[PDB]
Amino acid sequence: ATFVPRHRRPYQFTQLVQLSDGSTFTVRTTMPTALYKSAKDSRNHLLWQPSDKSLK
Amino acid sequence: SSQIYRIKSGVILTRPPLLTRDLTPFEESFYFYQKRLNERLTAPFRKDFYFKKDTAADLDWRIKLKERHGVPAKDIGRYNPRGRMAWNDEVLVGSQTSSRKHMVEKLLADAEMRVSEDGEEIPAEDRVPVEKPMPRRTEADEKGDVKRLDRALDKTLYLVVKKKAKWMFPTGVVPTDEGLHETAARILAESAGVNMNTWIVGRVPVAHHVVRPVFLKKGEKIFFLKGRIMAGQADLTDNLHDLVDFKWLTQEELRSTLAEEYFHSVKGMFAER
Amino acid sequence: DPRIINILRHFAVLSPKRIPPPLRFGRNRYLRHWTIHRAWLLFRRQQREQRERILMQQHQSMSNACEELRNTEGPGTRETGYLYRVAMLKNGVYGLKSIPIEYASRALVETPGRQAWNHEWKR
Amino acid sequence: GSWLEPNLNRKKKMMKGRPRVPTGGSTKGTTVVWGDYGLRMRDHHRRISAQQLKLAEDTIKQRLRGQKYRLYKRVACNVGVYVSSFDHWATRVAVNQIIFEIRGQLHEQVIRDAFRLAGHKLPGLYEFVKKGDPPVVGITKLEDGLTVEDLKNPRKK
Amino acid sequence: IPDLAELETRSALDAPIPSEEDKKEFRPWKRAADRKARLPSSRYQYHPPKYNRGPLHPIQSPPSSDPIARDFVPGPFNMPRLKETFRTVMASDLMTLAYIHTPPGTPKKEPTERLRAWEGDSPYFANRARRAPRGAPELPIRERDISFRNIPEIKEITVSTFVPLGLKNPDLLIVARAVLLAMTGTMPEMTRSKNNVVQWQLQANKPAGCKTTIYGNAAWEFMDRLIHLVLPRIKDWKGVPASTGDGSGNVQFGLNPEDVQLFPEVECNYDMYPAKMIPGCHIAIKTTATSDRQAKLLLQSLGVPFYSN
RNA sequence: ACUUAAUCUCAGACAAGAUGUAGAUUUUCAUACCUAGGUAUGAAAUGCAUUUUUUUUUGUAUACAUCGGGG
RNA sequence: AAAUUAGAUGUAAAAAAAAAAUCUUAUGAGGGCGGAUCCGCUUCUAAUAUUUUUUUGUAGUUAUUAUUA
């Protein structure tokens, strides 16, 4: 008699992630925060934007 | 003994969509339906795991939590997983709650701080609203500028050029020294300038157009490569080839401008959006 | 110790005995869920068949051009199929700098940023 | 290990056994496989010790010293001889089997003198063998079109 | 047409959309209140068995799709932006970048038997056991070309944390279990040590870590947080080593403890974990690719910078 | 064959591409031209070199087919 | 050097029909002939196996290309 395990998942919310460029997308996360304002990200890192001179 | 066909190498420079496609009505209703089902099967939210008791964050969460009638989520409306009225989890037709505009409204109505650092509720009139998201449709969308790359952010744009007149893509004769991928890169620089950041996908052609020879006239065998523009704008100033105008068109507007035979050959390369 | 108890209280809630029980739907609700389930799976089929149709058409276009390109000759005094053999080379395709980081890193976003596109980029 | 000292345990005692006596047409070890010339044991089957094979090698080296040659050994001492506890390592050799092989920029007569002197240090009678000559089935060389099936055929007269 | 006559005439899928008037009088909340009673229960009272005894047991378990089933997981809640981005635009490119044209009438390739057999004239060769794998002891998987029917994609991601010191301080494993809970959104499964080393004080068969595996959309969303929010914030980060890869299409790397707290889910409650109890994790990205170069190419298509190890 | 003790041999090939070079100064192609062909400036073809087993050279067929120490 | 984790083969999944032959089996035809079922001979059908045998068919669906209206 193989047991049927039941999934143990925590509460999840729908969060808006506003990157440093102002663009906003929706995500599914567990944190309670509503809007995550990201000041630093791939859009403001030189390694991901080598041609950008403002960050250089 | 002259060659019958003139080999040409062209580049179809395209700007990929910058925004996700609009969700269908079923997708919105389905997500809301599943989000509410998640309330009935996921563990309850422990505020003690994220907010310390008797702090600005805790007190601020508690006030807004009372406005949501105890629901820790902000995009599922008012629904209690437990109780005698948990069975009524299916919204009726027309429910604005399941719309995306309502989700963004509630989620942005929550990011504002309602309690100062001293634990006192900020007056409703002295509350700072958060900077709302940018609109999906830019000024070019309303203006209808076919020379802008901000237009139709939800669809792919194709760089089409006129030659002193028939609209077509940047093309040119292939020399004996360079190849197809080297020839296309040169034509793009001589046509639209070098001020655009472009990445040629590779060496394989995505489409081809054959103009059979008229027995006489020499046939044309055009092989079109595919290109991606990270940034920049096309400039026809001081172009070597006799180019007059350029415009960025969608897949729908493309068929109207280009000829039927010229379009029938390059439509196989198209994508979904 | 007090902080650890806060952690344990989180796991104690996820215990198999504490988590909610399996759903219990009636017939009318169950039938309604069946239609929602049935439609969603069919909707994926349409998206799948549509996504797979475009992928097929693009491959055919490449094969047509490539097969045709293999038969052509030139330019000038170049043996037939030279261009076909050169196009199939994969120099640097699997290298570190194959695909530019900037192009790949940029992704689709629900809403645009402050500056949707930068036309001032200079080589 | 080596060809004179195997990677075996001396404590584990072995039975005497008996050298291989092929009575079914086998020709294993009777031909020169690597070198150009060889040293064949042509009389009977014995059990050679590691002290007798080391002296044979030293004999060849002494005679051919200062010259370019490559000596191959076609036997290994993997049989522990226990003379009442372990005494020495030995090797079982069948009849008409090659013991050594050589190849290099040497004169054939100079190699004969080397193998000749090595046939005195080893026990038994030995024979100088070249590369390309037929094998030996028992004590009969398969020469003049003779095959291994003619030796098995009852009708021989 | 006779074929159409065989269809169900009383079709409910062809019924008109409900009107507005009837929509206004449909109030599930008013119906229950007015009744002031409990409606009789239905005689159909089948519930999924807690144990599956077997396929022929009188009581059977329903498929996991069924909502009543104890394995049911709520369906998708949103479209991961990275899954949408890759399929819509990136997929067409990878197919174009890596493509080898097959002639129209090319004969299909016959895969050779990797476990060779003995063929020859020796009577012994007939019943000889199949030869061993030539080269490595285990057979490596053969690479599949990138075609319109085979586009490498991300399938699942396994985050594994090893905490040797936990054995002595049991509070290191409790905090480690919580970090992977908020980071991934699943219930980690504790792991046990397998080797005994006295120098490192490691004892075998004792709980010394936990792990998680997220599949489907949850995996894509995890990559989004990693590539665009966590990895860019690491100080003096060079990239994923160019030597990563097991030879079958799976990429693996390790994060330091100070970069695990950079996760958006961990930093918000960074004060709820005791000091210096945040562990480091090993992230193994499993993809549909069939080779190391195809996998690295896929990650490069998602904006993953690689550095020469 | 599997296992045991020794010993021997090998650890690498082709096609294409690319890279230069002496050439011959012919044809095709691309430009500056003239008046559609030649006038030229180039490229290619051309012959052996050169690069090719994981390489900044891909593919095919193969066990991608090899590591430290000492002199 | 020695700690945990993730890996490490390939193929198939619309659908076949039909002719004879070689045995072997059958509580198949209660076969026939000698001595319903036992035993020895035995023809016929059926099934499995085998043939490289004799072939026929290899579609439909999605898309591409070519001609045709």
Ligand SMILES: NC(=O)c1ccc[n+]([C@@H]2O[C@H](COP(=O)([O-])OP(=O)(O)OC[C@H]3O[C@@H](n4cnc5c(N)ncnc54)[C@H](O)[C@@H]3O)[C@@H](O)[C@H]2O)c1
């Ligand atoms: N799963 C099937 O029934 C099925 C059938 C035939 C072929 N295939 C093949 O299997 C591979 C993958 O199957 P697929 O095409 O069904 O992938 P899929 O993307 O449709 O489904 C994969 C996961 O993403 C989720 N998902 C799908 N669409 C979504 C959306 N619009 N919004 C949010 N979430 C969404 C699904 O619930 C699922 O968990 C493909 O190569 C396909 O050709 C699958």
Ligand SMILES: [Mg+2]
């Ligand atoms: Mg003697």
